[PDB]
């Protein structure tokens, strides 16, 4: 069996709840689904619902009850959702649906998207101090999955990730950034699955690869936790011992793989960490050469930025860790994927549902050591009909890279769906995420966005 929740986590939980229970209540974000076989019929339903919502009877009915009723309707070809906090938002929203006009809190589409979603598991550079905390405190399903990863990581590494999440005083490091994002990635995916969602395919990026292997059915939750724990601690301990001449930095710079081929001939020890976008690459190596490429970008008008690490993931530097990584991962049982995988480790190539297991000890070693072919994997997805990309992350930084690839590939209207972001209400964010998934017609039981009704007052007399 597994360690329980630590007494300290409980202590921090009690105090967090104390704090939460004392903030001014913010009105919840409610999704309003409006659906029909034809778009014209959808637009008239929209207009009807709006009219009724303007009437005293409609004005007396809670947004939540309107939503629950709307959610129980039959959901057809042409869909819309209005995301609202209050009646006025709601009406303004529904008018736009009716008028075929655009709005930030509105999504409206003529029919389903024809291919399933790609779940993007990245993480690199997305951490922030409070990530996952608010959703942990407010969502029992999410909480449950966090606590399961917390239990398994306590077992693996001897500390509590949940403590970090709950404690505003702690920030994240090389090691704890990785396992905590991972917990959050696992819990988000399973929250989503709880509401009916499923990935058609996954794509990993750097530290996200362990989560993607779990959601692809490539490894058990325990074995995926091993992969992330083995690597993050080795990496943190290695990077902590680095000073002066051994230090290797990481930076994002606005050069393509092709520009980098030429540019690198001035910088013999630079390596490519992540091909992020067609025009963006994360490079790594000696500070003086990293500093030099940065200043050459600056002088050419190109963007660049350093990552906070004394160590360069995805290079030859990582060679001393591989011995121990190998040994720590003995026993992991790679399994046949239950969904498609764009493997950024394996150069962006696609592995089929039912295919051969890829997630063996050497995959983890290859992934840590070598370049991450993210953009190539994304292009491969797009070229095969995928248009929905949903990022499971505390902050949707990879999705922005995804966007650059889709556009470059000519897909100017992809479905780019974030989850959590810093400075956005986390409960709201997930409602929004599941509403988007509904609209585009991917798997998602919208009824589950509402608690089972306790009485007639939990429904609304919306027009037929």
């Amino acid at each position: 069996e597994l360690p329980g929740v630590t007494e300290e986590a409980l202590r921090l939980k009690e105090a967090a709840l104390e704090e939460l229970a004392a903030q001014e209540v913010t009105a919840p974000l409610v999704p309003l689904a409006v659906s029909a076989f034809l778009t014209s019929r959808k637009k008239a339903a929209a207009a009807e619902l709006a009219d009724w919502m303007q009437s005293p009877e409609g004005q007396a009915s809670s947004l939540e009850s309107i939503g629950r009723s709307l959610s129980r309707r039959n959901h057809g070809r042409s869909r819309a959702v209005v995301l609202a906090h209050d009646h006025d938002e709601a009406i303004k929203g529904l008018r736009a649906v009716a008028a075929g006009k655009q709005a930030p809190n509105v999504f409206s589409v003529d029919g389903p998207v024809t291919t399933g979603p790609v779940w993007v598991l990245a993480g690199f550079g997305a951490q922030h101090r409070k990530m996952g905390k608010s959703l942990y405190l407010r969502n029992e399903v999410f909480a449950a999955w966090i606590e399961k990863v917390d239990a398994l990581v306590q077992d693996e590494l001897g500390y509590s990730v949940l403590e970090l999440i709950l404690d505003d005083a702690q920030d994240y490091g090389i090691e704890t950034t990785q396992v905590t994002i991972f917990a959050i990635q696992i819990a988000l995916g399973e929250l989503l699955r709880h509401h009916g969602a499923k990935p058609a395919a996954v794509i990993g990026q750097s530290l996200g690869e362990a989560a993607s292997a779990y959601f692809a059915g490539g490894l058990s939750l325990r074995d995926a936790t091993r992969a992330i724990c083995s690597r993050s601690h080795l990496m943190g301990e290695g990077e902590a011992m680095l000073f002066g001449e051994y230090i290797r930095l990481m930076a994002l710079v606005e050069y393509s793989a092709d520009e980098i081929r030429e540019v690198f001939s001035d910088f013999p020890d630079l390596e490519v960490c992540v091909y992020a976008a067609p025009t963006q690459t994360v490079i790594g190596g000696p500070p003086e050469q990293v500093d030099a490429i940065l200043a050459r970008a600056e002088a050419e008008g190109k963007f660049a930025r350093k990552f906070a690490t004394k160590g360069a993931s995805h290079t030859s530097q990582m060679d001393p860790l591989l011995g121990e990584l190998t040994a720590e991962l003995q026993g992991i049982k790679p399994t046949s994927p239950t969904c498609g995988i764009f493997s950024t480790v394996h150069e962006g190539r696609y592995i089929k549902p039912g295919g051969e297991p890829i997630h063996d000890v050497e995959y983890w070693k290859k992934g840590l050591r070598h370049s991450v072919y993210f953009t190539h994997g994304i292009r491969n997805a797009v070229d095969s009909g995928h248009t929905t990309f949903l990022e499971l992350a505390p902050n949707p930084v990879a999705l922005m890279q995804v966007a650059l690839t889709t556009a470059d590939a000519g897909l100017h209207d992809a479905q780019l769906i974030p989850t959590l972001a810093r400075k956005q209400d986390e409960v709201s964010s997930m409602v929004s995420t599941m509403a988007q998934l509904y609209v585009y017609g991917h798997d998602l039981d919208i009824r589950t966005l509402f608690s089972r009704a306790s009485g007639p007052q939990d429904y609304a007399n919306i027009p037929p």
Binding site: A403, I417, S432
Partner: peptide, 10 residues
Amino acid sequence: DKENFWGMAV
């Protein structure tokens, strides 16, 4: 890119 209060890459 500014991903806004509703999950939209603006």
